[PDB]
C-alpha cells in the first residue's frame, strides 16, 4: 500500500510543497521545489494575540484588482514592531502582499484563521466563526478495534 | 490449621495460559494495526487537501456520499446536490 501511495506523494509535493514537507518531516516548515527535490526551512512560531486583521481586501491604488487573501499585521514579540503581511494556507504568514486577483462580483470567502474561520463579503470582512459552526464530512475510514476480554 | 484440597485437573490453568497467550498477542497486533490505520488517514488527509483544489466536484462527491457540485470558496468549498437525469433523455 505504501509503495503504491508514494506515487501520489511525488505528485503532491509538486502541487503544494509547504504542506507536503510539513506533514512529512514532522515540523511546520516551509519548502520549495529545486528540481526533483525540495529544500526546507523551519518556520518561526507566532502567538495569536500579536496578529490583527486588516479590514478591506480592496486596493485603493489599483481599482478593479484587489487582494485574494486577507491582509494582517503581526509582531514577532509583544513589544515587537508591527509588520504588514497576508494570511496564507493553513495559518502561515506571507511577508509579501502579492496575492492579487481582479475583483469579482459575488465575493464570499472563508479563510482559516486561528482555530476557526473568518468570513469576508465583497472583499470586506464580515465576521469570525468557530470550527464547530461548519459541518464536517470525514475523509477517514472508520475502523473499530476491540480487544479480547480477559 | 487447615488442610488444603487440590483439584485433580490442572487443565484449566493450561487453558488460561493458552487463552492468555493468544489473547495478549492479538491484543498487541490488532492494536498496532489500529494505530497504523490511524496515522494513515491523518497522513492521507494531506493529499486530499490538494485534490479538492484540482476538482472539488469529484472530491466532494466522494467524501459526502452524494453526487454534488462543489466550488472552492477560499479555504473551504461549497456544495450543492445534483438532480438525476434518465439515460434516454
Amino acid at each position: 500500500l505504501q509503495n503504491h501511495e508514494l506515487t501520489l506523494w511525488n505528485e503532491a509535493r509538486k502541487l503544494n510543497p509547504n504542506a507536503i514537507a510539513s506533514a512529512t518531516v514532522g515540523r511546520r516548515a516551509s519548502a520549495r521545489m529545486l528540481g526533483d527535490v525540495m529544500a526546507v526551512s523551519t518556520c518561526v512560531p507566532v502567538a495569536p494575540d500579536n496578529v490583527i486583521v486588516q479590514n478591506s481586501m480592496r486596493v485603493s491604488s489599483r481599482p478593479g484588482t484587489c487582494y485574494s487573501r486577507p491582509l494582517v499585521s503581526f509582531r514577532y514579540e509583544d513589544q515587537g514592531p508591527l509588520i504588514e503581511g497576508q494570511l496564507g494556507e493553513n495559518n502561515e504568514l506571507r511577508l509579501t502582499r502579492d496575492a492579487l486577483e481582479p475583483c469579482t462580483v459575488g465575493h464570499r470567502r472563508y479563510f482559516i484563521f486561528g482555530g476557526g474561520y473568518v468570513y469576508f463579503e465583497e472583499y470586506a470582512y464580515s465576521h469570525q466563526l468557530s470550527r464547530a459552526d461548519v459541518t464536517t464530512v470525514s475523509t477517514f475510514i472508520d475502523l473499530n478495534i476491540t480487544m479480547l476480554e480477559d | 490449621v487447615e488442610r488444603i484440597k487440590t483439584t485433580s485437573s490442572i487443565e484449566f490453568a493450561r487453558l488460561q495460559f493458552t487463552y492468555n497467550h493468544i489473547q495478549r498477542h492479538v491484543n498487541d497486533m490488532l492494536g498496532r494495526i489500529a494505530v497504523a490505520w490511524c496515522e494513515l488517514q491523518n497522513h492521507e488527509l494531506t493529499l486530499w487537501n490538494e485534490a479538492r483544489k484540482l476538482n472539488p466536484n469529484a472530491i466532494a462527491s466522494a467524501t459526502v456520499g452524494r453526487r454534488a457540485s462543489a466550488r472552492m470558496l477560499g479555504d473551504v468549498m461549497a456544495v450543492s446536490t445534483c438532480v438525476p437525469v434518465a439515460p434516454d433523455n
Binding site: 470525514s138 | 473551504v76 434518465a86
Partner: peptide, 20 residues
C-alpha cells in the same frame, strides 16, 4: 447507468473535512 446535472453551488451550503 444514469446521469447527474446541477448548477454551481452557493455559499449557503458549506462543508469542511475532519481534522486528525
Amino acid at each position: 447507468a444514469q446521469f447527474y446535472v446541477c448548477p454551481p453551488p452557493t455559499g449557503a451550503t458549506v462543508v469542511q473535512f475532519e481534522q486528525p
